[PDB]
Amino acid sequence: AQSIDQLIKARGKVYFGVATDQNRLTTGKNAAIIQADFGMVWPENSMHWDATEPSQGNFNFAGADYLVNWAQQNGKLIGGGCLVWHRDLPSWVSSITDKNTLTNVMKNHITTLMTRYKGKIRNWDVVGEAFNEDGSLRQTVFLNVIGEDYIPIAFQTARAADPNAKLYIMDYNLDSASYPKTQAIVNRVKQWRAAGVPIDGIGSQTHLSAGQGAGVLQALPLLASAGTPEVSILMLDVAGASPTDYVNVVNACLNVQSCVGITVFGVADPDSWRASTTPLLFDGNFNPKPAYNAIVQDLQQ
Template sequence: MHSVTLFALAAPLAALALPSGSLLTRQELQSINELFVAKGKEYFGTCSDQNLLSNQQNAAIIQTAFGAVTPENSMKWDQIQPTQGQFNWDGPDFLMDWAETNGKIVRGHTLVWHSQLAGWVNSVTDPAALTEVIQTHIAEVMGRYKGRIYHWDVVNEMWNEDGTMRDSVFSQVLGEDFVRIAFEAARAADPDAKLYINDYNLDTADSPKTQAMINNVNKWVEAGVPIDGIGTQAHLTGGMGSGVAGAVAALAGANVAEVAITELDIAGAAAEDYVAAVDACVQEPKCVGVSVWGVRDTDSWRADTSPLLFDDSYQPKDAYTQLIASLS
């Protein structure tokens, strides 16, 4: 893990070589990551990829304020192995090199997911063949970055809202055994990486989806499936922040070593929602980190809801200011 310097919690953005005339050059931005780590946590991160890391203003904010990066798209199956046996490493390599140059943790995202899946995978109907496809994909991707990626979202978004298993090529051909296959392949590929199962709408403790996650993870871990953590994405709407604490505590009650908030964004970005959501991780001993899903609203997948901590002009919003105050 990275060491924490408690006495250097602010850095003048003027020193980060931002473009002349940028509003940010006239402000001082504090590191939310350093304050969060000082609370005993491991990282406060965001997502990015080559196009945004090549944007000087965006990169400067991540350098100063955040401690981890998750590839937003470049490690998803349709990007990294669009054709069977042909891997595209350009985007992931760029992100890895940038992160290591700038001292950032990397969360790998994501290995087995029904969405943004290369079309050829959906045509695999034989269980033995699909097992090999999963194992090969994980071995190649995780193997390339072995020892360099801290967390991996191994299985992503496998639950329906009613707690049933989502229909996908993986569940159709292999049933729930695809989970065991994926996690065992991941453990073999990088024994030191923390292996996560990740999903959205795990935002209330008693929802069918949350309970399905907890009950099935307990079952799999008891059977020896190497699941280290549960990730709750936390794509929230306004007013939902107060419910995150109960949900995180419930997930932490599962038979896993740790949990994390992996893709936090909140429609409207109300300060009280962000403070409550982040505090949910601060207060839960098993919660190791928070990642917000982007830097500025313009670049968010939910741009029309203004869900992030920085506005379209890269200015920190009230939610960021209040998070700094809360963590301080």
């Protein structure tokens, strides 16, 4: 079973990565597969806000520490979870109505996580899921209380905390070039970067249905037209795991110079958040599926 990370590096990319966490690495065959076949690990849950700061100032780092240590001991790159988003946000944060307080709470959360792992994390998702489907800004507690400058503030705070990290904005449903959300994030990132905001990358959280891989061949070039140094495919899975869909997504990254790599949202189907759609590259016996072998063949040519 050849390594898709080694093959994608040979094509000039940085990594083929996977989401994982402590109890994945201690069960199944996940550790062995990640050691052999993937070049970068991401925290499935252990760096999100609900996991890391469940009460104000009460930081929970045991899970993230385990992942970072494991990655360093096994020579893997590390991607950092989402620092600022609304999903599963603890109630103590969404209850805050004072602009100064929330600004400092946001800054402290960013700075504390990034400082702890300073120099060890290749890229951080600083802001996630900030856009509505129509392309307007999603009305989260951060937008409602801080205002539109919360995105500039978050990225400026992150850059100061670890200047070595690549700083990403991330969203989903960026999979079609004709979708308003895709066009909107490009336009806003262009305008933020022109004003000096340090957005190094756009990460596309690519959760696809059967047959949607082909659209990424046109969407990813559009995302790259925003002019960020990097773009990436994040937390990829595909209902049905057709080889055609997976190969199309891989070729989209190969076709876009600034695409640095691809991360898949888990190793084996039974550990997927949508396991009934068997959407990953390894089956419930940890055997590589046809999609894995099709990626290998596509990368060899």
